[PDB]
Amino acid sequence: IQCSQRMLSFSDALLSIIATVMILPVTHTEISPEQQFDRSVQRLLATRIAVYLMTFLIVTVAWAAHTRLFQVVGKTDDTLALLNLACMMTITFLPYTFSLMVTFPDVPLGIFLFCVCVIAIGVVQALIVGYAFHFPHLLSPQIQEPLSKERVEAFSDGVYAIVATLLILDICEDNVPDPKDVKERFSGSLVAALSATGPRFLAYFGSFATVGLLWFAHHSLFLHVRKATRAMGLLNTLSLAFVGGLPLAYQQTSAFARQPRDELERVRVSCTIIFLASIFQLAMWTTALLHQAETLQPSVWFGGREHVLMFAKLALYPCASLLAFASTCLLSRFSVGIFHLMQIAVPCAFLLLRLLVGLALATLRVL
């Protein structure tokens, strides 16, 4: 008899890594063709994004099945650990098989391999269930539809870390000046070759800041959560799926625009991605408020001390993104500056959120 906490943490890390594999082809796509071939590049980008979304949803369904499986199975052991490793190895083949099926939809080998992988996952899970039932001491006490908050938190942390570190990984792997180019194309100057990669550094800064603030909101929310429901799970899944598109948005934004309208369009896309990623968390919070009596702590109830604080912490990014989208639509001249000032201020607001909330409450107090 052994504790299964670390095994489930490792499984969550593996699944979070496997769910964000189809987002690398997205971030590795050309920022622009520079040869008036925008149509084909956008076609391929949209196809890759759809494939990423579908693979993420499938891996999340698998992760939920795993969480239920190990919720009915309390304690683990050596054999159960090896079977869980086998299940993870089987799940690792879902993205490849799905991409193969969607790329060759005419030949039946792709769907065959996909169904084979699914049946293998199911068979491993059934073997785990059988081993757990043959040894009743490996079952939960209640055995001898709320999700597990620990698994949700671990999955979200892994996804956020990967999405925040994608760009720095790409930089460290690829954007390192080489002596030849440094002293040939930049006239013997390292500072020039480093400044040439300024846009990527700024994109990484912005993506990391945004992802970290979203994770901060998520962590402040789930600190007052008692029972995670399946609707909250779906909403968090959608939020995490739309969070993987922040690196691409920032890459496009930091890229030099061929025409002034492309800058506005890219800012709109980035603001929409952020708005979705944050409004899904806000929807999770509202669905929790629906049954706060059995979903949230008394501190964030209707009338608590940290209720308005959490409201604002979760509605800051959606409101800012909506205002930026409007400025892009209505003003259309000061949109980039507004977006940059939002990027620079939202962190400051998160830091001084309590003072601003108090000031606003005092403003509504005597008015």
Q: Which is nearest to 205 in space by CA: 147, 266, 246?
A: 246
- Which residues ranging from 188 to 247 are in contact with its own copies (CB under 8 A)? 190-191, 194, 205, 208-209, 212, 215-216, 219-220, 222-223
Give which of Cs ion, its own copies, none residue 293 binds (C-beta under 5 to 8 Å, depending on kind): none
Query: Is 296 in contact with 226 (CB distance < 8 Å)?
Result: yes
- Neighbour-count burial for 232-245, b at 16+ CB within 10 Å, e otherwise: bbbbbbbbbbbbbb
Minimum distance, C-beta of residue 304 to Cs ion, in the bound complex (Å): 28
Does 154 participate in binding Cs ion (rule CB under 5 A)?
Answer: yes
Give the three-state DSSP class for 48: helix
The one-letter amino acid code at 328 reads: T
- Select from 126, 143, 169, 231 the one that contacts its own copies (CB under 8 A): 169
d(CA 321, CA 36): 30
Query: Is 271 in contact with 251 (CB distance < 8 Å)?
Result: no
d(CA 250, CA 228): 32
The residue among 97 and 253 lying less far from its own copies, judged by its C-beta, is: 97
The residue among 20 and 328 lying less far from Cs ion, judged by its C-beta, is: 20
Does 92 participate in binding Cs ion (rule CB under 5 A)?
Answer: no
Does 345 participate in binding its own copies (rule CB under 8 A)?
Answer: no
The residue among 70 and 275 lying less far from Cs ion, judged by its C-beta, is: 70
Q: Which is nearest to 58 in space by CA: 22, 24, 89?
A: 22
Return all residues near 152 (Cβ < 8 A) that are at least 6 apart.
Answer: 222, 228, 233, 236
Does 233 participate in binding Cs ion (rule CB under 5 A)?
Answer: no
Minimum distance, C-beta of residue 214 to its own copies, in the bound complex (Å): 11
Return all residues near 183 (Cβ < 8 A) that are at least 6 apart.
Answer: none
- Select from 46, 61, 89, 345 the one that contacts its own copies (CB under 8 A): 89
Q: How many residues bind its own copies (CB under 8 A)?
A: 70
The secondary structure of residue 136, as a DSSP letter, is G
Placement of tokens 């785990």 in the chain: 128
The residue among 18 and 276 lying less far from its own copies, judged by its C-beta, is: 18
Return all residues near 301 (Cβ < 8 A) that are at least 6 apart.
Answer: 292, 307
Does 154 participate in binding its own copies (rule CB under 8 A)?
Answer: yes
Chain residues binding its own copies by CB under 8 A are 2-3, 6-7, 9-10, 13-14, 17-18, 21-22, 24-25, 28, 78-79, 81-82, 85, 88-89, 92-93, 95-96, 99-100, 103-104, 107, 109-110, 153-154, 157-158, 160-162, 164-165, 168-169, 171-173, 176-179, 182, 190-191, 194, 205, 208-209, 212, 215-216, 219-220, 222-223, 347, 350-351, 353-354
Residues lying near Cs ion in the complex (CB under 5 A): 9, 13, 17, 154, 158, 162
